[PDB]
A paper describes a structure:
The reason for this popularity is clear: DNA gyrase is an essential bacterial type II topoisomerase that is involved in the maintenance of the correct spatial DNA topology in bacteria. In contrast to fluoroquinolones, gepotidacin stabilizes only single-strand cleavage breaks, which is consistent with the LHS having an asymmetrical binding mode, i.e., it can bind in two conformations that are related by a 180° rotation within the same crystal.
Significantly, this structure did not suffer from the static disorder seen previously, revealing an unambiguous picture of the relationship between the compound, the protein, and the DNA. In addition, the catalytic pockets display two different configurations. On one side, the single catalytic metal, in this case a manganese is coordinated by Asp508, Glu435, and the scissile phosphate, which is not bonded to the 3′-OH as the crystallized DNA is doubly nicked at the cleavage sites. When the DNA is uncleaved, this effect would presumably occur as well and only allows the scissile phosphate to get close to the catalytic metal on one side only, thus explaining why the compound stabilizes single-strand cleavage.
Residue numbers in the entry:
A (entry chain B): 417 to 545, 580 to 639, 1010 to 1491
B (entry chain D): 416 to 545, 580 to 639, 1010 to 1490
Write the structure that this text describes.
DNA sequence: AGCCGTAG
DNA sequence: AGCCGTAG
DNA sequence: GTACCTACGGCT
DNA sequence: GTACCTACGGC
């Protein structure tokens, strides 16, 4: 992949390490091939602080860098053999580019420290704003980033080896906890010191993954990519009453407008939202191959089509009534929602799993009937205990059904945000003829790959680690649903075999609850009640702001109607005034002065079509004014009393529970 | 390998479904009856065994997986009693590409597993039409329509006549193009299945679709469907030169869903080529970012790049919304797309075309726009002009990459017959480099030659000692210098001999084989230069006539509305009275029609008039537009009244485009 | 172990 | 003999 | 994140 | 038409 320079004098040669083959090509065309070589890197590179030496030396990108530098590594390092006296790290001016910069400096620090000591390592400063370097023309890349006359290289300086050892170990090492402590301590929610570069670049990445990638918002239960998919469905009018739109149109629109990342991240997030084995309350309605419980992917996006589910309407309801704050998108050309109205408790209903930096999240899904009953109970008693809430919310409710063993993992998880919940397949023992039995499995645990669970059992049989199994078949079908059959040898105890299968395979699997979500923009480990309280506060805010919006808009409309009423009662004088006016401006001024009209009222009268002077329009306008004064009074009543507002939240939660509430699928059995 | 087997080990009742890939495979896996139905997904187009050598057939992954699956072995070692399925079901996608892959499969079975067909073990599934792949289908629809024994219609492949079948597989699938071409021209219309009938009908379906709807350009606008749909999508999304670049994914996503039911890479790569100044003599797309290089680097992935129309692409689209060209239904009946673009410059000859179809191909070189328009103008003044006279305007091809053409006799034969060989050469000079030594410096290479591959070939000849006298080889190409390839020559060696050897042994000399095939009245045709210009000029005459006819209808319709508004202004008191004394819009419309002798359209426009239209300035604006339209209408009538004025208007508009976009010749034609 | 799911 | 450009 | 199989025809 | 790389955390 190396595109070398022509000069064989290392003193004046430079090698640019660029994030992406997409940037590689721009930089190859734009470079000065006499003195500038290019080695493009395919995305995230090996973290050498976590990897053992066998994996480091077999890694394609590391090998290409070692061959290109020509110095060898560690103990066999020789600075005099360096093929370039400038090694230039040139990544995108975004958080993933900072991450790649931390990974490259970790490699140089641990295998090529004298390269840094000699002042041979530099960071390029490409201009900010742009997509990647792949969005830049060759000439822009040359003039801003690569051209000796104009560019600003940072030379990487090592000041203090002990501090640097400790920084690489803490930031990039296998011990998560010190990285988490660093993030919590530091997070605000010509030359470059390597320790400063590593701490600042890693913190930029960690914080961005925490607040803007991997973790859901407590209020609507969404990560940014899901929020942008649902918002795009909404803005393109992809409602349940409309036909399915081609997945590429949805994904293309979301990529350009809201989500400046790869198409696969968007499409696969949308596919999960459509799978009834992944989402307890699916958010997308898919037509075509949307994957299986066997880990089949969806068909490529050219094939599949999608729209909202009915319940997704409830995530988006009131978004256009100033219920939630809009923000600038990534390039300032669009607006997107910071959070959805979320008129049902989506965080807990659909759950969330994510790997961030310094932390992860693992929130199981729940029954919507149970959750809303819980919110209602909380709404009537701010002091309700977790144990009282568990009279409404028995425990998780998986889309895949199955069993939970006992209540003690559920209780610790609801109390602390952490606990181990044992999920068991639904299996029964049945006769199959001539005194023989089988185990039949019709439900498996949440997030278990059925085919992979079957291969694991087949492995135990083949390797003789389990006695008594004579055959193993997936008889799953559209007619039967999931059906895995394990034949038992005549006179073997099938109950012993089953208990052994639970021990030795994913037929029993734990759900490690770790309820981390964004609360006021910061990650926090939350308990069940804390999660319900933030949700209920969101609903109160949503319904208060919607009532405030409806009130402004109803007063604005009453104001226009007062103006139209004047105009129709005085139509001869209105028309005379307009006709005798040379311009809009003169007409506006004369109407305001003669009939006590506001600018907006005069504007509306000037915009009135001649058809609005028909006989029964005067009466249609009087009817609407009377209904609005009535409407205005109802809205004021709601805003005047926190109890009426709260009763309106309860009633709307109750309507959604009655329309979308369903039976529990997962059975909770005594442990 | 990829086989998902059935559970029954009794071949008599087992079926294997051959589907295109995992996108279809997944629907098929979810829908199947796993007791008796196995699925082997393929990997798209399979090896044509009638054209391939035996070593490549036996090492081909998909052929091996099918052989292993069937369990019968092949040719001489074939054993029907070892067959693992008594039904082998071809279930390709229902598109023409699905039919092609079916012809390739039947060719394989016929040549290597003939007894499989003789025994009645090969079947064709009939999945429903209007689905691009089975991945578009829900698993239940695939089961009920195509796979379910109770309802499906399988075709059993019958062999009736082995001699006829031998001759059919040889003609359709064998390496002799001419018999396949004769078959296409003879047959092209511009329970049980006989294998001969299936092969002829399915192959003809593919051949005709690739000829009329893929690989060959229309003589009128010079475009293939994928280019036309990219430019139309640029138009419909408002992606004009005055607007900012839109992300490539939005363009490609839109074109895929609405117009082009094929892979995203066929769309994006076609759009990339249209943006490269080394591929298109008059680039049709304006790209931002990495759009590839002369070294065969691709564009960056579509997330990284942005695009809009070039100014000259405005001239391809100009007047498309003035009923100049016939719209047709898109692939699914949900959208409209153009059959052809207005093409206000001679784009077929200007940008040229290369395409591989079935039974034929096309190879049309690009041309200088100034020369071509001069040629159209000369043709316009003399229908009887000779090829020789036209060559006073059009010297020969003009490549975006410049270089030299050797002599006029290939150009002449190609312009006279549609076929001829054009010898292209690099621009190479011999220059001194100091100390009595010389070098060859190449600053232009031939059209469609990969510069890096040309350099690797020279390096190969030096290393293998097949060329004497070369001491160094450098690409000194840069944005400042443009293309610069330096070949150092050994002291006292003849650099002119070395250059002539490079012309012999490398792409530094390369031929362009002209083969000017295009769609004429929807049928492929070998055309000469004059025929190409005649169809172009007839297109322009029709476009300008239809635009004048459209402008005239629309101007009369608009004058008719303005006559209505003028009456309303002249009698405004009576108009207002009439509307005010009407109960409803309907009654008002009727009374205006009766009282002022107005049409429905005129009454509706009066009813739609806003009160601000009654101000001085707005009254004057209605009078001013009526007067301008009467003048416009009179000019349009004068054009339609005289074919010479119409033709003079074509000439003047071609002349404007020549003056604005016409540029210097780049390729030198040497005698 | 290597899996879950958003990233390059 | 392998390249060119729309296709699976 | 990026790369390599396949068809097809006519030049070399 | 699709197959292999990477970070990141917790079990
Ligand atoms: C698939 O299997 C393999 C196997 C091997 C591969 N080796 C290298 C590179 C790729 C990826 C190529 N390809 C991905 C999808 C992109 N198009 C999506 C897209 C569609 C629509 C829209 Cl709007 C946006 C993006 C094109 C590039 C490999 N892929
Ligand atoms: Cl209007
Ligand atoms: Mn980036
Ligand atoms: Mn297909
Ligand atoms: Mn009159
Ligand atoms: Mn990816």
């Amino acid at each position: 992949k190396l595109a070398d320079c022509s000069s064989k004098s290392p003193e004046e040669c430079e090698i640019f390490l660029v994030e992406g083959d997409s940037a590689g090509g721009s930089t190859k065309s734009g470079r000065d091939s006499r003195t500038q070589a290019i080695l493009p890197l395919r995305g995230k590179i090996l973290n050498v602080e976590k990897a053992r030496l066998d994996r480091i030396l077999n890694n394609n990108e590391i090998r290409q860098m070692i061959t290109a530098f020509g110095t060898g590594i560690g103990g066999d390092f020789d600075l005099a053999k360096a093929r370039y006296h400038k090694i230039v790290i040139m990544t995108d001016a975004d958080v993933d580019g900072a991450h790649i910069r931390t990974l490259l400096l970790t490699f140089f620090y641990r295998f090529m420290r004298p390269l840094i000591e000699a002042g041979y390592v530099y960071i390029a400063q490409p201009p900010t704003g742009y997509k990647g370097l792949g969005e830049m023309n060759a000439d822009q890349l040359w003039e801003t980033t690569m051209n000796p006359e104009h560019r600003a290289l940072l030379q990487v300086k090592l000041e203090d080896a002990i501090e640097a050892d400790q920084t690489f170990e803490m930031l990039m090492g296998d011990v998560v906890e010190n990285r988490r402590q660093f993030i919590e301590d530091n997070a605000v929610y010509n030359e470059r010191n390597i320790t400063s570069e590593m701490r600042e670049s890693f913190l930029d990445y960690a914080m961005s993954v925490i607040v803007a990638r991997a973790l859901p918002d407590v209020r609507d239960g969404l990560k940014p990519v899901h929020r942008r998919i649902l918002y795009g469905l909404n803005e393109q009018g992809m409602t349940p009453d409309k036909s399915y739109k081609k997945s590429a149109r949805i994904v293309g629109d979301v990529m350009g407008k809201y989500h400046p990342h790869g198409d696969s991240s968007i499409y696969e997030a949308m596919v999960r939202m459509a799978q009834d084995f992944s989402y307890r309350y699916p958010l997308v309605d898919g037509q075509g191959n949307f994957g299986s419980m066997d880990g089949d992917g969806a068909a490529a996006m050219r094939f599949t089509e999608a729209r909202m589910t009915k319940i997704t309407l409830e995530l988006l309801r009131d978004i256009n009534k100033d219920t939630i704050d809009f923000i600038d998108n990534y390039d300032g050309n669009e607006r997107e929602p910071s959070v959805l109205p979320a008129r049902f408790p989506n965080l807990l209903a659909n759950g969330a799993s994510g790997i961030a930096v310094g932390m992860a999240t693992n929130i199981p899904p729940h029954n919507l009937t149970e959750l809303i009953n819980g919110v209602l109970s909380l709404s009537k008693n701010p002091d309700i205990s977790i144990a009282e809430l568990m009279e409404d919310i028995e425990g998780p409710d998986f889309p895949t059904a199955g069993l939970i063993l006992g209540k003690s993992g559920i209780r610790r998880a609801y109390e602390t945000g952490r606990g181990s919940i044992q999920m068991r397949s639904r299996a029964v023992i049945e006769e199959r003829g001539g005194g023989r039995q089988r185990i039949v499995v019709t439900e498996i645990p949440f997030q278990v790959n059925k085919a992979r669970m079957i291969e694991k059992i087949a492995e135990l049989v083949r390797d003789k680690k389990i006695d008594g199994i004579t055959d193993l078949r997936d008889e799953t079908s559209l007619r039967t649903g999931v059906r895995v059959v394990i034949d038992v040898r005549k006179d073997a105890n099938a109950s012993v075999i089953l208990n052994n299968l639970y021990k030795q395979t994913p037929l029993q699997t734990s759900f490690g609850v770790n309820m981390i979500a964004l609360v006021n923009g910061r990650p926090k480990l939350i308990n069940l009640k804390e999660a319900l309280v933030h949700y209920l506060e969101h609903q109160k805010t949503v319904v208060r702001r919607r009532t405030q919006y409806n009130l402004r808009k109803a007063k604005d409309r009453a104001h226009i109607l007062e103006g139209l009423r004047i105009a129709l009662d005085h139509i001869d004088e209105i028309i005379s005034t307009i006709r005798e006016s040379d311009t809009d401006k003169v007409a506006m001024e004369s109407l305001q002065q003669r009939f006590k009209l506001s600018e907006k009222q005069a504007q509306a009268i000037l915009d009135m079509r001649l058809r609005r002077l028909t006989g029964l329009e005067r009466d249609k306008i009087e009817a609407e004014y009377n209904e609005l004064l009535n409407y205005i009074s109802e809205l004021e009543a709601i805003l005047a009393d926190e109890e009426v507002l709260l009763q309106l939240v309860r009633d709307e939660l109750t309507e959604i529970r009655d329309r979308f509430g369903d039976d529990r699928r997962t059975e909770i059995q005594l442990g």
